Amino acid sequence: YIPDYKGMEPIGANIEDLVDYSKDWLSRARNFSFFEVKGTAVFECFNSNEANHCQRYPMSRKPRNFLLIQCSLITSYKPATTLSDQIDSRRACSYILNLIPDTPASYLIHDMAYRYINLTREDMINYYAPRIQFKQTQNVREPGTFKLTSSMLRAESKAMLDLLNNQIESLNIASHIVQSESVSLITKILSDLELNITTVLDKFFQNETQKYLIDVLKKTTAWHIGHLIRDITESLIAHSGLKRSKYWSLHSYNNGNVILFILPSKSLEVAGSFIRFITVFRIGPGLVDKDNLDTILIDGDSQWGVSKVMSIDLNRLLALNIAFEKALIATATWFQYYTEDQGQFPLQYAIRSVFANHFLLAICQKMKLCAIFDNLRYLIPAVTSLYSGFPSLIEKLFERPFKSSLEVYIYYNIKSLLVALAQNVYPSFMSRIVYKHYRSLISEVTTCFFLFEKGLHGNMNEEAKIHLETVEWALKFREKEEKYGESLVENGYMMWELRANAELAEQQLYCQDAIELAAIELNKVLATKSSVVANSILSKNWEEPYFSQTRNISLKGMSGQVQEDGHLSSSVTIIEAIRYLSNSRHNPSLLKLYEETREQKAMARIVRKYQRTEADRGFFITTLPTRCRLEIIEDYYDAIAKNISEEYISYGGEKKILAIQGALEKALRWASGESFIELSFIRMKRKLMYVSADATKWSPGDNSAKFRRFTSMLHNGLPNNKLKNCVIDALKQVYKTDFFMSRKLRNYIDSMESLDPHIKQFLDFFPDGHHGEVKGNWLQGNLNKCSSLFGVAMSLLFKQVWTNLFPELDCFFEFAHHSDDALFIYGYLEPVDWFLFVSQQIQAGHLHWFSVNTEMWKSMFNLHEHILLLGSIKISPKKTTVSPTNAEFLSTFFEGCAVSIPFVKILLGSLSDLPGLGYFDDLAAAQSRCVKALDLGASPQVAQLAVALCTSKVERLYGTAPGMVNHPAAYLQVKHTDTPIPLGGNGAMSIMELATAGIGMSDKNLLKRALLGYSHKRQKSMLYILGLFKFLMKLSDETFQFSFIGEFEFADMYTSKFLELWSSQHVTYDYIIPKGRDNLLIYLVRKLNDPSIVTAMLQLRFRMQAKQHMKVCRLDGEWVTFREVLAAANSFAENYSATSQDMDLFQTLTSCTAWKDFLNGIHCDVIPTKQVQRAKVARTFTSIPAVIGYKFAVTVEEMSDVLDTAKFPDSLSVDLKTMKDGVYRESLPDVMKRIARVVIVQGNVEGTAEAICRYWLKSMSLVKTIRV
RNA sequence: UAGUAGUAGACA
Ligand SMILES: [Mg+2]
Secondary structure (H helix, E strand, O other), X not given: OOOOOOOOOOOOOOHHHHHHHHHHHHOOOOOOOOEEOOHHHHHHHHHHHHHHHHXXXXXXXXXXXXXXXXXXXXXOOOOOOHHHHHHHHHHHHHHHHOOOOOOXXXXXXXXXXXXXXXXXXXXXXHOOOOOOOOOOOOOOOOOOOEOOOOOOXXXXXXXXXXXXXXXXXXXXXXXXXXXXXXXXXXXHHHHHHHOEOOOHHHHHHHHHHHHHHHHHHOOEHHHHHHHHHHHHHHHHHHHOOOOOOOOEEEEEEOOOOXXXXXXXXXXXXXXOOOEEEEEEEEOOOEEOOOOOOOEEEEEOOEEEEEOOOEEEOHHHHHHHHOHHHHHHHHXXXXXXXXXXXXXXXXXXXXXXXXXHHHHHHHHOOOHHHHHHHHHHHHHHHHHOOOEEOHHHHHHHHOOOOOOEHHHHHHHHHHHHHHHHHHHOOEEOOOOOOEEOOHHHHHHHHHHHHHOOOOOOOOOOOOHHHHHHHHXXXXXXXXXXXXXXXXXXXXXXXXXXXXXXXXXXXXXXXXXXXXXXXXXXXXHHHHOOOHHHHHHHHHHOOOXXXXXXXXXXXXXXXXXXXXXXXXOEEEEOHHHHHHHHHHHOOOOOEHHHHHHHOOOOOEEEEEEEOOOOOOOOOEEEEEOHHHHHHHHHHHHHHHHHHHOOOOEOOOOOOOHHHHHHHHHHHHHHHHHOOEEEEOOOOEEEEEOOEEEEEOEOOOOOOOOOHHHHXXXXXXXXXXXXXXXXXXXXXXXXXXXXXXXEOOHHHHHHHHOOOOOOHHHHHHHOOOOOXXXXXXXXXXXXXXXXXXXXXXXXXXXXXXXXXXXXXOOOOOOEEEEEEEOOEEEEEEEOEEEOOHHHHHHHHHHOOOHHHHHHOOOHHHHHHHHHHHHHHOOOOOEOOOOOEEEOOOEEEOOEEEEOOEEEOOOHHHHHHHHHOOOOOOHHHHHHHHHHHHHHHHHHOOOHHHHHHHHHHHHHHXXXXXXXXXXXXXXXXXXXXXXXXXXXXXXOOOOOOOHHHHHHOOOOHHHHHHHHHHHHHHHHHOOHHHHHHHHHHHHHHHHHHHOOOOOOOOOOXXXXXXXXXXXXHHHHHOOHHHOOOOOOHHHHHHHHHHHHOOHHHHHHOOHHHHHHHHHOOOOOEEEOOEEEOHHHHHHHHHHHHHOOOOOHHHHHHHHHHHHHOOHHHHHHHOOOOEEEEEOOOOOOEEEEOOOHHHHHHHHOOOOHHHHHHHHHHOOOOOOHHHHHHHHHHHHHHOOOHHHHHHHOOEEEEOOOOOOOOOHHHHHHHHHOOOOEEEOO
């Protein structure tokens, strides 16, 4: 009932007081926090940091390894098969046995080759045999392994095995010798990798992309070496099973030239496990590092390189498996960007070198390189800006040991590139070309950065790193509390305290007057839309049940009760919901739950986000009362946030780019024309300086208590303060939290047995050794809408103070705040008399006017930063860049109105992130991410190439590819093109059709081509396809994208048959979430036992190799394999006979489901004009479950639940009828159950749902304009 | 100086 609370009393805060303080503070000399970029300054920073680094780390004479797998190719590579594998293994063992071992690695290789070549005939028959045909033997225990005891192991081999089963340094980068050696080595490797080995969309692809990219790259040794690495990694993954990992293995590739020896290892299924192997190759061009080779045996006029015993984890193994494609996709993206930039096609040598560099980066999956590229992606914007904090970025760059010889090469490259950039046409990073646009260079380095997989950090020395920041800032907060008193820090310091001390204006301390005036400036705007504000505030689920929302049902992850170990349990949200519902007697609303759990202390943990940044960020797992309080605050401020612009987090994930582009366009429109200043006119030029700003420590270095005062003065449309007081109390109860250290960190501390001083300082934060109190720091991600709104309010307060300071100048300001990320557009005035006016103003008693005489934007930013510090927002000196032409926001780059959104992240993620729901499901998902890239800016040719790559990957993984086990052609009497996708199918579909028509069209189109065959011709093959479709329909009906497809704590509280009966009885609950306690509890128990939920709660990517031959599909309510499903499909289609109802359904579906004809029906021709690139912009594409819940609603409880769920309470009936009409345009329970976008265009294109399709048709050609 | 990782002792 929203009980009353302690509402805060406003105090006498006056804007004039802040204006006077601003006058006094601006009347003196201020130190700019940014440095003007120069070639001399950047070079001096590099030299000084080199000198310091020479003594920071101990020198290392021997550069360390950087290539995970070493192999060499001199002829074209043919993919390996079982027969070729056996022949090559025989040849390779014969070659190896005629060599003299020198090192323990060579001795072990010789011993294993001798053992393999002496395996009996039955062993070699069972070796290479399929799983079904395999039989156990003395010498062979698994299809691709053999045993090796100590009896057949030499003394040296045993010694090296003991070495396996048993202080940081750096290279002298300041030395020219080390740099020269590293550059020469990496240049040799790249030159070896560049060597040559000796519809309308289809025609455009073959003319532009195939001719100039694929045909050029088909002969490079990088291409064939990528294929060879794919084969080697496939063999390694096959060995990494839970059964095969304990044995030895031997494989050979490329006519016995490359040999892989797999040592016993822990299976990659277990966490923190490595697979150990040795690769022996003939010395030649390729990924050869002579210094890091274990040995180079000398055969007769030949050299055999034996590499070191490499231990590779699952992440790096899966990265190496798909690295030909990550290199190919990156090269295609670079090709498209070069075409956009220079307007012509890249030459052969440039594209070959780019592909070689991308392949080398994809192979060397090392954390040091990932950190270097993470630093570089911020360093490049700093040196191309007018003022930036580049010295700090260079210092952070020099904070790493350059152990590998690749890191020295990349460091030399980035040093040269940054020195060249600061001295100025934008030089490229991996080529000798020079770009015409900064967006191309920044996209190139971003693409290089995205080639590194997420989670390359040390598994153990990162859980401490994620804790250190929180502990350090909590200690700083305690120090401030002891220095200034608990009351001052919690409630904020008065304005006179700031005027007297002047050291109070820092982080974790806020000024009450600043908060109040910021709230006043925001509610001045809010007074115009108070009605909408109240409507949005009341529109949230204040009185709705708490656990009937989707977020509280999800599996995201939350904490549990404190256990006897003293640690905080890690459960899922659904489990905590079930627990509380079981203990409670009713399902309370948000406010009722908050009142129930108000007295409980907020507890939290931290877990890794698994990013690719230099330092891994950890996100916090909060308990249930903490989640309730944060949801209250977030709902309130999000409701307020939407009705105010200049904050771009309340906006949807898709409207942010449109909003920021509109803001930039408004800034550009204002910049047009001049301004007139009254002499007391004078003409003044209107300038435009963007400031891409970031906060130093958004969450850790803030004081959440400030929001209290904000919420006490923010004006909403509500008549009473009950909700505002509830939000204030929720803010009060989230002030102090119990930060719990993880179990891994506790075990790490326990195993130490002797603590370093800094580990002791970290540990004393936790008194009992498990949890420590953290004050004033809202945990990361918990308060983002509120923080963005507060930042916008502070910016508006600064704008008001500036306007009151100099009313004679009509300056222009915009602010964009997406949490810590921000963009400040400053339109100031520049003289074309101004100095005389400034002198007169100074002599008139306005001592603060002298800050505007020259470079007024400096003083504007100084005042803005100080006013932001009057809260707790510290603009980061490092990652904030000012520039008069460019901007960076929301991970996108703006050239005025032009927008450049990276689309590489989802193109590369198509292969690396497969959902695993099912063959059709994951194939559609992978095809969907190519559509998203096509929306974000990828050209149709690049999207087509990427989609071909990922569907080839899915076909290879599931065996659907022709010639393999699960090829439907050999068991379904079809041509593999007339096969439904859920039962195989080609899956090759034009990206245009997926983008426009839909993803499942490849099935539906077939249906049409079936029906036209069955009606006009009555062919038996069409009847067979119809039977296949009927089998899919039957499976979809039996088991219950959008198409027909073919243990825990509380999961055992209700019987499975009880769940089935309940689901059959309460049909409506399949579409709506219940509201009563018992019904919601049963719904949640059923949700726990859903196979998709259990599977969802990468390891799946690795385990799919074994899952391929196991029973994963569902047939007649039984778990069966895919091959049996295909055989059943063949039998049922052969025994299928047509019926009237099926024919009627097919005619209705084919008549009601067309866009393909328009795509290929339009004409195209090359206009005699070269393609010109314009400033790209963004366009847009231009409750239902409740009515279905109404349809099956029978009981009073279900009727009440569906009534509450619907946005419109009593309109459902009418809506249902209208929906029925819609269905009749495109009633029975069966048919009812079965029925159940921003694109980066060029400037000219319209925003119609067909205009974007026409633009995509235009964009298929990359260098030539076309006409429709 | 077997690998990954690391100016947090890990995988073991
Ligand atoms: Mg930024």
